[PDB]
């Protein structure tokens with residue numbers, strides 16, 4: 001339960017800008033969650049740079065080799081851009097050829113056409129970047145988009161691993177990130193997990209929100 | 225005729241990544257154009273960083289004061305993010321507080337909800353960032369989004385002013401940028417104009433491409 005420097009830095013900022021919030025939220029999966037992590041609150045020049053640094057440190061740590069960083073609409077779009085920039089800035093010589101890409105929700109019926117903006121994906125190694133993983137639906141849809149574009153996914157990175165199951169009916173009790181990793185045979189990286197949030201906020205948190213967090217995790221929390 | 229250094233550098237950048245395409249393109253306005261400037265081709269970390277620098281210099285030298293840099297979907301999304309970062313990096317204390325924002329095409333039906341990602345627009349001074357202006361429809365629609373959110377548009381910046389009319393029926397034949405600027409009483413900044421890129425390319429434009437561009441501008445080119 002010991003946090004790394006860049007994780008402590010990231011979580012400190014997440015609290016400051018109110019990216020991490022407690023209440024009542026309908027997730028994309030339709031789950032009623034007592035907390036929500038909104039990366040859209042990292043919205044100053046400094047916070048965006050700090051956010052990009054957090055991802056870049058996690059990516060550098062993994063020693064993963066890739067050509068394009070792909071961010072799915074919508075949260076993934078600014079993420080792909082800022083992290084691509086950051087990796088070329090702090091990568092030294094390893095990420096000097098690094099490219100970015102993202103998708104439109106719908107194919108463009110004029111201009112250059114297509115759904116992919118940025119780098120062409122065919123025959124390139126792709127890192128998928130996103131904000132959070134819950135049930136893993138978004139990443140699976142991103143995988144298909146990339147597969148259809150003839151790119152090869154070599155990994156994924158998220159800011160927050162919510163440590164939830166794909167479905168409550170899954171027998172092994174593997175988290176979404178673990179399921180995706182095993183399913184595609186690729187590393188799934190994260191800056192922090194829910195466990196890091198709980199252990200970091202330990203020094204200054206109720207004790208009433210914890211009740212709702214534990215109640216939510218009995219339903220959706222991974223056990224493996 | 226006489227280019228500023230940041231313009232020279234940008235034009236070099238545009239040629240480096242070959243952002244200017246030739247062929248037969250249907251524009252968003254439905255115009256059939258012999259050329260197409262695709263900002264999606266600034267697709268490496270270095271290209272994105274240098275692209276952001278071009279926007280940032282132009283913004284800084286305009287002395288415009290604003291709170292949020294807003295980029296319309298889709299091309300404006302990475303632009304708002306990278307230029308927000310860049311301005312905080314090179315702009316000094318006058319730009320340590322600016323925030324970025326962008327829109328989804330459709331309202332989010334869950335989570336944080338809404339159409340705006342990043343900074344809330346209400347009660348803030350907004351600079352709209354986009355890639356190109358042709359007929360000006362995108363910037364008008366961005367203005368409407370911001371105005372309906374009770375934000376205050378204070379200016380706009382694009383990479384390329386295509387120097388075309390809003391409508392062939394407009395009486396003075398002012399360009400789209402000139403029309404938008406007068407209409408809203410706001411500056412409309414552009415890194416470069418069509419005439420800059422054509423002049424810069426010199427003999428690199430073919431006889432076929434030259435003739436097609438002439439024909440296009442006889443129809444759609446501004447005169448004021």
Ligand SMILES: O=P(O)(O)OC[C@H]1O[C@H](OP(=O)(O)OP(=O)(O)O)[C@H](O)[C@@H]1O
Pocket residue numbers: 028029073074075076130131132133134135136137138139176328332335
């Ligand atoms: O693991 P999952 O269950 O798929 O949920 C996680 C996804 O949900 C959100 O996207 P969403 O489309 O809701 O929001 P956005 O429009 O802000 O990207 C989030 O950005 C993740 O991509």
Ligand SMILES: O=P(O)(O)OC[C@H]1O[C@H](OP(=O)(O)OP(=O)(O)O)[C@H](O)[C@@H]1O
Pocket residue numbers: 104108111252253297298299300354355356357358359360361362363400
């Ligand atoms: O001045 P106008 O006549 O409005 O044309 C310029 C706009 O057209 C393109 O957007 P589009 O929605 O076609 O493409 P995108 O989805 O790649 O942003 C371009 O990115 C500008 O925003």
Ligand SMILES: O=C(O)c1cc(=O)[nH]c(=O)[nH]1
Pocket residue numbers: 026027028029035036037038039131132133134135335
């Ligand atoms: O599952 C989601 O929809 C979701 C959860 C979360 O914590 N943050 C987010 O942006 N989306």
Ligand SMILES: O=C(O)c1cc(=O)[nH]c(=O)[nH]1
Pocket residue numbers: 111250251252253259260261262263355356357358359386
């Ligand atoms: O008008 C357009 O659709 C358009 C023109 C252009 O040169 N580049 C672009 O991205 N869109």
Ligand SMILES: [Mg+2]
Pocket residue numbers: 072073074075076138
């Ligand atoms: Mg998303």
Ligand SMILES: [Mg+2]
Pocket residue numbers: 296297298299300362
């Ligand atoms: Mg656009």
